[PDB]
């Protein structure tokens, strides 16, 4: 089994080589990855970062961007995960196929985010913040990335205050999702790299 919803299905043909399995999986997740690249190019200040820092932000942050974008695949009420094919699998079945604490943590994350029911504009600006907030270990011009982060966070505060003048705490709640995403990213990378 391959219990990642970026796949078309969690079932693996055991008579395929590791390479064929990855190739097929890549045909499923690659369009999503390319969509994050096009999204990043549309953050105006992103293009002013060095080419190295652009690539490194995408390398570190693509997972967190997609986690936000695809939080709606996790239906906490139905306890189902929708895979990129549109097929749905119960949490129980996925656990029997080898999913565990990480899947549970993503449900918890998605439930809390899904429940905020952000508008498209709010979700899009939050996602920009997520990308530019990516792990900085690979970054050559930290101050430039921090400046862009600050600019986007200010825009997000302004948008949230417009849209939620009596619930400003939504802005703080969104910032507090950043270390949660970093945790999901760390745990997920461990699972990704352990895949045999
Ligand atoms: C291109 C991006 C991604 C790749 C290449 C990838 C790959 C993988 C691989 C190889 C595994 C281990 C599968 C197994 O052992 O059965 C995994 C686990 C998983 N991934 Fe992904 N993934 C990606 C993005 C995402 C995203 C964006 C999400 C959430 C929206 C996600 C959700 C999950 C879940 C729920 C698991 C199982 C967690 C558990 O074991 O409890 N993946 N991923």
Numbering used by the authors: 381 to 576
Q: Paper's wording?
A:
To shed light on the structural basis of heme, gas, and redox regulation, we crystallized the REV-ERBβ LBD in the heme-bound state. The formation of well-ordered crystals required the addition of trypsin to the crystallization solution. Two identical structures were obtained using constructs comprising either the complete LBD (residues 212–579) or the LBD with an internal deletion (residues 241–579 Δ 275–357). Both 1.9 Å resolution structures include α-helices 3–11, (residues 381–576; REV-ERBβ381–576), which is slightly larger than the fragment used to derive the unliganded LBD structure. As predicted by the mutagenesis and spectroscopic analyses for the oxidized state of REV-ERB, a single heme molecule is hexa-coordinated within the pocket by Cys384 and His568 side chains. The structural changes that facilitate heme binding are confined primarily to helices 3, 7, and 11. In the presence of heme, helix 3 straightens, swinging the end of its N-terminal half (Cα atom Gly398) 16.4 Å away from its position in the unliganded structure. To facilitate heme binding, it also undergoes a major conformational change, swinging its C terminus (Cα atom Leu576) 15 Å away from the ligand-binding pocket, forming a gently curving, uninterrupted α-helix that covers the ligand pocket. First, the imidazole side chain of His568 makes a ∼120° rotation around the axis of the helix to allow bonding with the Fe(III) heme center.
Physiologically, the REV-ERB proteins play a number of diverse and important roles ranging from the control of circadian biology to the homeostasis of lipids. The REV-ERBs also bind heme but, unlike E75, the heme can readily dissociate from the REV-ERBs, and this reversible binding regulates REV-ERB transcription activity.
